[PDB]
Design a protein around this ligand. Structure first.
Ligand SMILES: Cc1ncc(COP(=O)(O)O)c(CN)c1O
Ligand SMILES: Cc1ncc(COP(=O)(O)O)c(CN)c1O
Lengths: 428, 428
């Protein structure tokens, strides 16, 4: 009897109010049939839509909800804090507290600047790297996402890796002209870029595990190679940990892999469900940021007390013993259970997980890069995704997004999910 | 005795955690003596610091607090909404509600996209204008502020006889090369740019009343001229109403002046004290925004239900009869009271106001542009600012920021503020 009738009505109205009916493109479900699920509420590992359907959720609002949606302690903290005002536009003690917690948690971060989104964090960190090195070019990887600042919106493909051409209309060629690209997991391509642009490269930036082209982890050779190559040449290494931060380990991907970058961006989890980003790193670099130094970046709502409170209480929960070990346990079971279901029902699949982050592809694999991920059978993914909705499971509405587990997911949530997957896979 | 003991200790600690001890440059008080006031709470028109000092606040968290800080109805709405979760990462009904309200309120907006800051809104609107027109250049005015995207960080004087130059390290030369500039209130300079760059200009963007170089209103000739000139040449007119929106009138400066732009950015008031921005305008233009069209912009926390709720209830209050008439009454009295106090005490001053936005300069004036504003006696401003703190009044900690009133400011507040101003002015 599964119905999305109320979502259908409200989304039809939305399309005449907002472009494509949404405030972010993935939300429009275009690759999975075009009927988004409008959300009424979330709690723990569950989401309820406006039709009243319940789902075991593996999106976690794209990463923030690692301790569970609408956590009671976080809500109580927000309720108390808001009595004193939600925005100050001036320093407050909560900013000191969250800053101290982040510096303690994340290996590379000795000093930190809070902003309102991952997009802002990545803008700031790029400007900072360019300012510190007095160099304009940088390297990013095809398939990585660093928000929508113009410099990141660069076209990749045959014959254009060194050209910095725009990947979207409205982005002038000049804006992307200092952006170089290489394939993820291709150290040799990066070596070639270094050789052809001696003295011009400020930084290499990467998602230390790709989550925005599906789940794609780095090979040890690649990620160590980047650390060595950058260090040997006085180039900065930047980890975009907006998604991996506080999710792969308390100290993020840099702790998980034991590789320490020069600068790090954060977001999502550090806002505890409110809009917050950050960039931080080596103190000598961070001292270039205004008003300590000449590099300009500013925000009105940055460091607001609600966001700080939510972040503080989220990190306090995560810092407790056994957190990441629990995520590993349930996510290993989930990932291997889904892949085994695919094997049993005759569908080529591959995938993997680290702590609370996972993904699977309808492809033989292995998947090492963006190009590999494009081998995925997206028609089949769509059938799987829609079938799972009907069975009460909500995965990311795209083959090209990672999935997320939370501390509120139980072993039973996982078992019910695997069972549903087996049923759906047996039918598609 | 006026004591900032606890603020001094906490700010010293902050300087070892965040660059310059702050999350936005103006907060460090560098132009007014360097000892920021750390905030404990805000309510109505008042702020209390961590040392227990009370102030009548004319900053309003830089614009969001137009109905008063910590409004009971807004807080009650947040308390109810948060029970259902603070972030969904997917569409919800509250997004439809705020979108409808914004479309109704703002003349130019037929379709709207929500984002997490004014910086993001201005990035998006510029990319959109460039995409729609298929042209790369745009015009910005000296003294206007549109957030910190690279294209806007252009050095004073550049972008006229030489390509736009970086105003900050870390901004590549190429990034500002498509930015043209002119003095505010200089229509002739804009006409010259149009004639010199035929087929190359996407848009003119401006604060329709400047608030980021002090308070500087447009002359009728300038703003009327811009609307006709853009129309005549197929160039988009963009109003950055992040600060003026919902403050000069329910429909912002465009309503107040009766001049309808093609695109508008919003922020601040629209989030009711939470991080929210938006860009919107003519439907045919907005249909280019992904996923309706090819122009890329995205955001994880965009349209989150907490921020939507806060905006909805803030706008609901503003829509009540008498709002802007009240703001006009108290702000006229405030502004003229301060200017009269300056005259009586022998200090050259000039200033002005519209509705809930005002400013004064320690300069003879009149001030028509950025260059004029820079004739201000900033040493005297600092003395005035610090003296007023001790009298229990908190103005913006800069000569180059506008001031803000709210529905919670009362004739009592205004009377007390003017009396304090005369006491301080008679002594500095
Ligand atoms: C790795 C990465 N970087 C940056 C961003 C941008 O963050 P936001 O959406 O908050 O702007 C995201 C969110 N998609 C992300 O996952
Ligand atoms: C006119 C204008 N435009 C854009 C911005 C940038 O907004 P945010 O600080 O939210 O990024 C500001 C700061 N209030 C502003 O005043």
């Amino acid at each position: 009897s599964f119905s999305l009738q109320k979502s259908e009505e409200a989304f039809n109205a939305a399309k005449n109010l907002m472009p494509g009916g949404v405030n972010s493109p993935v939300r429009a479900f275009k690759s999975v049939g075009g009927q988004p699920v409008l959300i009424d509420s979330v709690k723990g590992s569950k989401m309820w839509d406006i039709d009243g359907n319940e789902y075991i959720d593996y999106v976690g609002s794209w990463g923030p909800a690692i301790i569970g949606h609408a956590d009671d302690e976080v809500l109580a903290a927000l309720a108390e804090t808001m009595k004193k005002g939600t925005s100050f536009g001036a320093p407050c003690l909560l900013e000191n507290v969250l800053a101290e917690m982040v510096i303690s948690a994340v290996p590379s971060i000795e000093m930190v600047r809070f902003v309102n989104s991952g997009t802002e964090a990545c803008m700031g960190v790029l400007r900072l790297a360019r300012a510190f090195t007095n160099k304009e070019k940088f390297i990013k990887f095809e398939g990585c996402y660093h928000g929508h600042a113009n410099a990141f919106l660069v076209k990749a493909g045959s014959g254009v890796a060194t050209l910095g051409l725009p990947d979207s209309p409205g982005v002038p060629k000049a804006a992307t002209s200092d952006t170089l690209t290489a394939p993820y997991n291709d150290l040799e391509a990066v070596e070639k870029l270094f050789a052809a642009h001696k003295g011009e490269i400020s930084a290499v930036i990467l998602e230390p595990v790709v989550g925005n082209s599906g789940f794609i982890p780095p090979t040890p050779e690649f990620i160590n190679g980047l650390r060595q190559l950058t260090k040997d040449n006085g180039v900065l290494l930047i980890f975009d940990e907006v998604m991996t931060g506080f999710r792969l380990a308390y100290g993020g991907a840099q702790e998980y892999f034991g590789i320490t970058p020069d600068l790090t961006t954060l977001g999502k989890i550090i806002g505890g469900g409110l809009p917050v980003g950050a960039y931080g790193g080596r103190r000598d670099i961070m001292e270039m940021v205004a008003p300590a130094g000449p590099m300009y970046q500013a925000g009105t709502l940055s460091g607001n007390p609600l966001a700080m409170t939510a972040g503080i209480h989220t990190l306090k929960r995560l810092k407790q013993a056994g957190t990441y070990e629990y995520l590993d346990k349930i996510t290993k079971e989930l990932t291997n259970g889904i892949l085994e279901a695919g094997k049993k029902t005759g569908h080529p699949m591959c995938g993997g997980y680290i702590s609370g982050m996972f993904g699977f592809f309808f492809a033989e694999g292995p998947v090492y890069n963006f190009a590999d991920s494009k081998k995925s059978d997206t028609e089949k993914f769509g059938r799987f995704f829609r079938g799972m909705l009907e069975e009460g499971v909500y995965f990311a509405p795209s083959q090209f997004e990672a999935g997320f587990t939370s501390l509120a997911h139980t072993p039973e949530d996982i078992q019910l999910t695997i069972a549903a997957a087996e049923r759906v896979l047996s039918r598609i």
